[PDB]
Write a protein that binds this ligand. Sequence first.
Ligand SMILES: O=C(O)Cc1noc2ccccc12
Ligand SMILES: O=C(O)Cc1noc2ccccc12
Ligand SMILES: [Mg+2]
Ligand SMILES: [Mg+2]
Ligand SMILES: [Mg+2]
Lengths: 273, 274
Amino acid sequence: SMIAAYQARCQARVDAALDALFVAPREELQRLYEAMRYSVMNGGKRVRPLLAYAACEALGGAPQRADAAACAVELIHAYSLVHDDLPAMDDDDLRRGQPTTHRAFDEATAILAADGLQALAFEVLADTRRNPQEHAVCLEMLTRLARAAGSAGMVGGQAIDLGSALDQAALEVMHRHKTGALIEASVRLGALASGRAEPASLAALERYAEAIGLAFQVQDDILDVPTYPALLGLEAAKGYALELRDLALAALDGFPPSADPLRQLARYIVERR
Amino acid sequence: SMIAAYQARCQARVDAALDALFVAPREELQRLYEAMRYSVMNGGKRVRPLLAYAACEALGGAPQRADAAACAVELIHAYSLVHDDLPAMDDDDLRRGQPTTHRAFDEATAILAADGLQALAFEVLADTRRNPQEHAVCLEMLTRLARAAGSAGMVGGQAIDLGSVGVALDQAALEVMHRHKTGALIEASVRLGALASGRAEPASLAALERYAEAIGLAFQVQDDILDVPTYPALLGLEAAKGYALELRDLALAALDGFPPSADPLRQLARYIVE
Ligand SMILES: O=C(O)Cc1noc2ccccc12
Ligand SMILES: O=C(O)Cc1noc2ccccc12
Ligand SMILES: [Mg+2]
Ligand SMILES: [Mg+2]
Ligand SMILES: [Mg+2]
């Protein structure tokens, strides 16, 4: 039950690292960089960074090895939200009570700040001073993030959602892309940064990540009340959240104690209110 | 011309490689991928791919080694235009007589297709089957593209441009804008081709960078001239023309010592100023 403290450590660390990325290299770029900062440094909970750090630790790596991975996944996350808020998409004036970037600045600046954040996520992984892994591991991290962030993962999920009656299978297809791909990548990138990845471990961590990404979405529908409770019934939806947590924990069977943060996070997701 | 034939070879080759990237992996993604395809496969001249291929050859590499580089720079270019056409940006309904992507599909789909194109540019460079360089070189290619494409390069240029509305820019400020908005990506195209050669060294990279700096500006000056806060408005038409010639001269001088395999870059520099 120190998942809260684990979250707070991960957030403080990744926040410091992210904040350092938003220094305009010349004066004409100051507003752009302020918009980028405003779009990331918004008191978010940094679950994706948490996942990168915890995955790294689950395989025995010191967590600071995952700092670039943590930044990269948060940058992809933050850029996706800026675009999602835009009037052509979700058209939100607020995000967690605060003006969205296109309201605080302007629409063009929001489109562009977020574009710059996506490039920066890749920059941060390719940079061998910030991400000092073996070169082949850096490339695999970049590969995985590009596939997860793009039109076959996250962006694809946004298009599926836009394009959606819907049965359970199709709802799951959507979530698996829209949020699952980047959750799985956060876990995968942290695991790579451990220096101890092995195929069987990576697979197990992927099963974990698939289960939790879904658990979160089921539990969120439950807390709200074409949703998991409408589809399954409220009480069966609650049962399914438990089954997902269980699948997550079973995927971690045989991992050492250093995987406890991942176990605790899986419980936390279904125990929240 | 020799440069016309060179351009045509580069355009055929990169187009074939790009066209293969737009197969939706499942049916729910079809429309997204059609929008991606629509945004790239639009008969563009592929100057950034030409620069990658020509820079590669200038250093003695077989040009197919630059295929990934060529695709990646064109994907960045393409995505940038999709966002730039949107109603909050330049609000353009047409590009060369054809509907822009938000007009052909819708604004959200355009935003997302181009988002996916940016990712894909990085995917192609990081994929060691598509971009089979030494791993350290792949990482440098990715680094250089990310910096050129981002808030310190291309995206930065777009922001300088929006921050300059209603301000009379002098030549120095106009050049700062152009260097970021278009120069960064042109310089990266040349640099990534050079890296793909397998023969890059610091001296030759620096000289190619000087060449790319000159031709990137020459393109903009010449474009303003052909149209006739622009280069002709600032300088007068005749002095703008003289400057385009000076820029071509700087480009040709930067290629001092290069072998005949650099002739494509020399011929391009002349071509630009027509
Ligand atoms: O358990 C808690 O009190 C809050 C918390 N713990 O772990 C978290 C992870 C993400 C978001 C919130 C949390
Ligand atoms: O902060 C978030 O993006 C939502 C979130 N809060 O807790 C999560 C767990 C898994 C996936 C997502 C979450
Ligand atoms: Mg829901
Ligand atoms: Mg236009
Ligand atoms: Mg002009």
